[PDB]
Amino acid sequence: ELRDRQAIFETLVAKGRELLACDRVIVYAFDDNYVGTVVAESVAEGWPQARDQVIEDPCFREHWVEAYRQGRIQATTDIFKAGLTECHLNQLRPLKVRANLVVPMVIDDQLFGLLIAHQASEPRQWQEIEIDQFSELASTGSLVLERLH
Numbered sequence: 001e002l003r004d005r006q007a008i009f010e011t012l013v014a015k016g017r018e019l020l021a022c023d024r025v026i027v028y029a030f031d032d033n034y035v036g037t038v039v040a041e042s043v044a045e046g047w048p049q050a051r052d053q054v055i056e057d058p059c060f061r062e063h064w065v066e067a068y069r070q071g072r073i074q075a076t077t078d079i080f081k082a083g084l085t086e087c088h089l090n091q092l093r094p095l096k097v098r099a100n101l102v103v104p105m106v107i108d109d110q111l112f113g114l115l116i117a118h119q120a121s122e123p124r125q126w127q128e129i130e131i132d133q134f135s136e137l138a139s140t141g142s143l144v145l146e147r148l149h
């Protein structure tokens with residue numbers, strides 16, 4: 001029952017990477033300290049795997065929880081041109097991220113986590129249709145989980 005959650009997470013990451021033809025898609029799920037765990041991952045062969053990593057970034061609890069709960073989407077063509085400072089880039093470096101797309105998963109009016117896509121090693125001008133499909137995907141999976149209780 002509760003473990004059926006995982007089936008949804010696996011679907012989101014696999015479908016997401018297929019939709020975007022990007023290098024990695026993860027579900028990054030928050031605990032009650034807004035520490036995120038990579039609970040699911042679809043990653044093309046040969047790129048670093050983030051699955052099961054716990055990645056604590058205080059920026060979320062300090063700055064961004066409500067914004068994402070309210071539907072914030074961050075598309076980034078080039079992480080080196082996005083005003084992201086070294087303390088941010090340091091987290092993305094090991095995973096070879098160069099472009100990314102962050103969309104929220106909101107369940108029962110609470111920020112469950114984020115669905116995140118990465119393009120490795122090259123910038124990527126995310127398209128309107130790509131952002132819309134990816135955010136839809138996160139919203140759909142969230143609504144399924146919300147309806148299953």
Ligand SMILES: *[C@H](c1[nH]c(/C=C2\NC(=O)C(CC)=C2C)c(C)c1CCC(=O)O)c1[nH]c(C[C@H]2NC(=O)C(C)=C2[C@@H](*)C)c(C)c1CCC(=O)O
Pocket residue numbers: 055056057058059060063064074084085087088091092095097100102116
């Ligand atoms: C907030 C922030 N961090 C992340 C992290 C990730 N992006 C990914 O792709 C992945 C998977 C590998 C992770 C994890 C995101 C998406 C955001 C939100 C960006 C936004 O919505 O604008 C954030 N963290 C930092 C680094 C900060 N954290 C630290 O531990 C230290 C030290 C830091 C130096 C300040 C920064 C700079 C941000 C954005 C600005 C901020 O909130 O301070």
